[PDB]
Design a protein around this ligand. Sequence first.
Ligand SMILES: [Cl-]
Ligand SMILES: [Cl-]
Ligand SMILES: [Cl-]
Ligand SMILES: [Cl-]
Ligand SMILES: [Cl-]
Ligand SMILES: [Cl-]
Ligand SMILES: [Mg+2]
Ligand SMILES: [Mg+2]
Ligand SMILES: [Mg+2]
Ligand SMILES: [Mg+2]
Ligand SMILES: [Mg+2]
Lengths: 290, 290
Amino acid sequence: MFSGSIVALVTPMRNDSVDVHHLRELVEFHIAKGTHALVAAGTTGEAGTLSHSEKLLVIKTVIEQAKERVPVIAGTAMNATKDCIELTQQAMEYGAHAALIMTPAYIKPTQEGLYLHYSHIAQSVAIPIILYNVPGRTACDMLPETVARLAKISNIIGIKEATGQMTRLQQILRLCEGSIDVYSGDDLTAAQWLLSGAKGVISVTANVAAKLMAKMCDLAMDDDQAGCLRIQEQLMPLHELLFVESNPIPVKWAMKKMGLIGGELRLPMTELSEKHHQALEKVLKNLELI
Amino acid sequence: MFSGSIVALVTPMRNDSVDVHHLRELVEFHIAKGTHALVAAGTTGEAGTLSHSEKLLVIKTVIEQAKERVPVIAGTAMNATKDCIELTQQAMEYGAHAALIMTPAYIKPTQEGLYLHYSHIAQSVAIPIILYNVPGRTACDMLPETVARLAKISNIIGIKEATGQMTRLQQILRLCEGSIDVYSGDDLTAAQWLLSGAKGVISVTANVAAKLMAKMCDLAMDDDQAGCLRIQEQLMPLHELLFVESNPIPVKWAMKKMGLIGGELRLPMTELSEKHHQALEKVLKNLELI
Ligand SMILES: [Cl-]
Ligand SMILES: [Cl-]
Ligand SMILES: [Cl-]
Ligand SMILES: [Cl-]
Ligand SMILES: [Cl-]
Ligand SMILES: [Cl-]
Ligand SMILES: [Mg+2]
Ligand SMILES: [Mg+2]
Ligand SMILES: [Mg+2]
Ligand SMILES: [Mg+2]
Ligand SMILES: [Mg+2]
């Protein structure tokens, strides 16, 4: 349903309120740069500290500004199944084209509990759903067998798989045989995944290098393996630096430096440590982004 | 400020709402069995899937029923520092004796961001605070160096350190030299911790074996290593089974078997798989709890 470079948008903030002005500008930037879809209120968008109202404001802002020029995916995870259904229902009603649903965090449901969670959400809300597995943050790993069961629920169209593990990508494809799209959720390994059966990448780097990310994905879609890997190597110093502290700390600093946003983070997230500024400015300059 | 066996209370549920009747019975049960303090709305209380309203109802219920006969600690973690300040303030206003504050989950702040988080909470709300570190759930490990800085903020009284790693208890004690109390957050290693400088255990097993946990802790406090270890070895088969699926799935099953609660869990948490029932029932019988 989606492909290519899908940006996990930061949520611009100004004096601890959502910076609608800059968020709208980012939608126009991505449309101009040829990003293939937008994710609103994902992890890179500080979903973990935004209130329910703010998540909805961010989703609505992006959808309204896009004016059907580029698809919009809404992050709608909540730990309780009943809460996730309500948030996913409002994102659907706002016009989101799909819901990206991270697993519950911290509470560590069983595989059974994950199946019940997503199957209840999909039965309750008539919107395409992209599963999102990121055990390195949630302490919950969705196993490939669970993935294959959920692929039989027809509104479950995709999985953003952030583990960076090639054997994980290959076990899901082996078990599902096309019955679910896999999107990389790890910029550092995205090109290998796009060349090995993944449909796209839900990307942090695309916030900063949108054109190059779109190009890299387009070359992979054109089976230009050498071309794709060429651009991946060009990005790799930027990919590494964007996780030097927890995302979205580095990306906000880079976008700050580029003049795209104020670069504010809501506590307990903090602006990028001064020790990394030098290395990241150097990368941004080389890539001609500043 | 606290010591001994401190129960992380389950939150009894009925019809997907807080079961205030059985929650009040549990408060009387602990007073009768001699539990040393009660934690309301912690991880064992399903804090991760309770709404804000529900958390305050559990905390208020516990405080009111206790009638100052036993101290009450309120779980008040939120990811965003400003929201944690609001919940912690409310708990303080309701009369909680301290607030148990887990780190942010899933967003993975830096250690500076954890110091800002807890220093701002402590600054803003005049209540004792017990830090709570559980990186196996939250993907955030608060390091001993950071704990030693926070111990210099005088309303930070304690840390519930849930790693179960003896070198971690040792390093806090070494860096802090008594400037902060350490509470075990891991029943499986709690006796060795109590015998090695920890002040108490914030316990899951105490929900089910409240009299034995209290005597195990009393014996540790009396410097009776053999008597303490003897009870810990009697409880060890129960400790093990209580984590066979994510807490509080097994403990709520055991409490159901004991007639103390209905044993309902909010999705995506699921009642204990049948394959564990026989082993856990045999243990409860073996301990004369059933
Ligand atoms: Cl910003
Ligand atoms: Cl991960
Ligand atoms: Cl790659
Ligand atoms: Cl219950
Ligand atoms: Cl842990
Ligand atoms: Cl032990
Ligand atoms: Mg629609
Ligand atoms: Mg399908
Ligand atoms: Mg008071
Ligand atoms: Mg002190
Ligand atoms: Mg069952």
